[PDB]
């Protein structure tokens, strides 16, 4: 999903709000902030109601202006609440009654997702690959800066995981794939407008193809 | 035009989500309190620092950490949620590594701790993959031009830690002494370990 959450390469932001080894304070800065992750794990591990991928996607589905002005831990409060409503566990009415006011949720999905690809390739370390030039309206673990770009394989994982574009929509056809550390030259991704060396993106097999 | 939506206070919303679930018997006794304790006391960059200090003083362990990070971390019992498939990435005289999650916040929780606010900022997420040298400079870390910067974007299930170079002036130090100078920011890759005067 080409949403505002896909921030890598966006220009115009200011300084990162940190200097090295500065005090970051406690783990949680307010008494509620442990709740979104805790309740995420309840939903995944105890209820079996959703996957972690569905949590990533529902945060992607926040209305874009809403995403941009919401602090990090609040986005996950909104996202977990939204999944609980969508899955039929809770109602928005009861959330708003308990909250004593408005509790706007993420927007409905505009895509049913897509299955794990049927035709993929097992790549080897040192091989050149291209990121498939595809557009996915639902969930995908491919930042747009690498779409269509060429890099080389630095690692193939020894484990395999469900394809995000399926499991992020709660589908039954996510299969399993390894991922690949794909190293891109900075100039492949941003031309002359970069001061870096290389970027390594961890890409599902189903996002890749042999380079020309 | 472009206004925020009306919202109850965030604390009220977060505790409303807890109570809605808890009141349906869906949250076990002590469940969120137990996770709070794990997040605050167990998941910690002190663990990654221990791993770095061991690698610096034990060539066999260093090789293991760089080839099968998961196995190395498992020897210490530090695998866990958001930290099941670990890859450690080696700085060298000509390479500086840096970690980000441009899409959200993905981090090797058990051995780095939960991410700091700045790592989850839109500024870091947008800029470090495109202009890491300027970002690090602004944060207080000068990386000379003879050093390639390599940014790892945590886009799938691999969870990373940086193995920084060991600084001069630490020869013969104990693992405990070494650990003390390996900070959270060293593990993320935005800082280099510092040796006092
Ligand atoms: Cl609170
Ligand atoms: Cl250019
Ligand atoms: Cl292919
Ligand atoms: Cl911070
Ligand atoms: Fe993330
Ligand atoms: Mg975009
Ligand atoms: Mg030495």
Swiss-Prot record, chain A:
Industrial production of acrylamide is now being developed using some of these enzymes. This is Nitrile hydratase subunit beta. NHase catalyzes the hydration of various nitrile compounds to the corresponding amides. The keyword Lyase applies. Keywords: Lyase. Its EC number is 4.2.1.84. Belongs to the nitrile hydratase subunit beta family. NCBIfam families: nitrile_beta. Heterodimer of an alpha and a beta chain. Gene3D superfamilies: 2.30.30.50, Nitrile hydratase, beta subunit. GO terms for molecular function: nitrile hydratase activity; transition metal ion binding. The keyword Cytoplasm does not apply.
Swiss-Prot record, chain B:
Keywords: Iron, Lyase, Metal-binding, Oxidation. InterPro entries: CN_Hdrase_a/SCN_Hdrase_g_sf, CN_Hdrtase_a/SCN_Hdrlase_g, CN_Hdrtase_asu/SCN_Hdrlase_gsu, Nitrile_hydratase_asu. Its EC number is 4.2.1.84. Inactivated by nitrosylation of the iron center in the dark and activated by photo-induced nitric oxide (NO) release. Inactivated by oxidation of Cys-106 to a sulfenic acid. The modification Cysteine sulfenic acid (-SOH) is found at residue 106. The keyword Flavoprotein does not apply. Fe(3+) binds at residues 101, 104-106. Belongs to the nitrile hydratase subunit alpha family. Heterodimer of an alpha and a beta chain. This is Nitrile hydratase subunit alpha. It comes from Rhodococcus erythropolis (Arthrobacter picolinophilus). The lineage of its organism: Bacteria, Bacillati, Actinomycetota, Actinomycetes, Mycobacteriales.
